[PDB]
Amino acid sequence: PQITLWKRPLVTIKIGGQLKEALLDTGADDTIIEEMSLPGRWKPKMVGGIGGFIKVRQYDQIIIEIAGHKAIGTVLVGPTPINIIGRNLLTQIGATLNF
Amino acid sequence: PQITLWKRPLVTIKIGGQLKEALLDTGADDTIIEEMSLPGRWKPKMVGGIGGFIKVRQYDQIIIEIAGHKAIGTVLVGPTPINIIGRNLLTQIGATLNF
Numbered sequence: 572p573q574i575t576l577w578k579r580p581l582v583t584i585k586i587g588g589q590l591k592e593a594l595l596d597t598g599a600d601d602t603i604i605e606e607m608s609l610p611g612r613w614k615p616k617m618v619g620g621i622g623g624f625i626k627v628r629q630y631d632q633i634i635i636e637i638a639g640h641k642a643i644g645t646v647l648v649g650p651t652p653i654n655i656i657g658r659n660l661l662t663q664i665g666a667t668l669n670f
Numbered sequence: 671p672q673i674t675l676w677k678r679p680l681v682t683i684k685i686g687g688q689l690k691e692a693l694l695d696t697g698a699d700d701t702i703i704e705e706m707s708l709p710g711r712w713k714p715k716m717v718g719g720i721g722g723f724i725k726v727r728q729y730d731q732i733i734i735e736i737a738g739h740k741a742i743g744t745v746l747v748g749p750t751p752i753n754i755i756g757r758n759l760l761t762q763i764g765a766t767l768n769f
């Protein structure tokens with residue numbers, strides 16, 4: 572699709588076998604999902620946002636299906652206000668900014 | 671331009687004689703730039719993101735060139751680690767997210 576930015580670019584994702592929504596975020600280097608369980612071992616990390624750094628669990632090689640397109644990569648879990656899909660996964664769906 | 675996301679989508683911006691860089695940020699409602707203090711009246715306000723909230727000064731009707739395109743709108747000024755071009759000015763420059 573071609574998504575205009577009149578409103579927040581939310582799409583349906585599927586992760587851990589569950590449907591959720593998430594924000595497609597060209598400004599985010601990483602993908603971060605609201606607290607949930609995921610398989611495999613995780614490592615503790617910190618990541619910084621506009622208001623300071625948060626603690627998160629980093630999971631590797633996680634499958635997300637983003638608006639019907641498959642992506643696999645690192646997914647952080649931590650206290651985010653909203654699930655965000657950042658550039659590490661947006662590149663695998665060929666997403667681009669056009670103007 | 672059709673911009674892929676293998677790296678951060680930074681562009682040159684010009685606000686009032688000052689040449690700066692900023693991140694085209696689909697995941698941001700607002701435009702936030704670390705600046706001296708633009709001309710005109712402002713009002714204080716708190717904006718947030720991952721990690722909590724920062725204090726900004728809100729300026730309306732700011733004229734800023736973004737990647738060679740003219741936009742006029744609200745610009746928030748305060749202590750952001752990275753300057754960001756949010757959706758309120760992305761729509762003015764005709765930016766869309768595509769995949």
Ligand SMILES: CC(C)(C)NC(=O)[C@@H]1C[C@@H]2CCCC[C@@H]2CN1C[C@@H](O)[C@H](Cc1ccccc1)NC(=O)[C@H](CC(N)=O)NC(=O)c1ccc2ccccc2n1
Pocket residue numbers: 579581592594605652653654
């Ligand atoms: C709406 C309300 C009754 C307050 N319920 C909740 O907020 C529950 C409470 C639960 C316990 C606390 C931890 C989170 C869970 C899940 N949340 C809902 C959570 O799963 C759901 C995710 C979502 C967002 C947008 C579109 C679809 C789905 N978020 C929400 O319902 C709330 C309300 C809203 N205005 O959208 N959204 C947000 O809180 C939120 C905050 C910042 C954002 C920035 C950009 C884009 C979206 C943003 N959404």
Ligand SMILES: CC(C)(C)NC(=O)[C@@H]1C[C@@H]2CCCC[C@@H]2CN1C[C@@H](O)[C@H](Cc1ccccc1)NC(=O)[C@H](CC(N)=O)NC(=O)c1ccc2ccccc2n1
Pocket residue numbers: 594596598599600601602603618619620621622652653655657695696697698699700701717718719720750751752754756
């Ligand atoms: C997600 C993460 C990997 C942590 N990356 C980032 O957070 C980087 C950090 C960078 C350096 C500091 C300044 C921002 C840049 C770009 N961001 C991405 C950037 O896209 C970030 C993603 C985001 C969206 C919604 C909620 C929280 C976080 N957006 C933002 O920080 C924008 C800023 C703004 N316009 O006010 N926030 C929001 O648009 C927004 C909207 C509603 C909200 C409700 C409750 C709490 C926070 C809310 N934030």
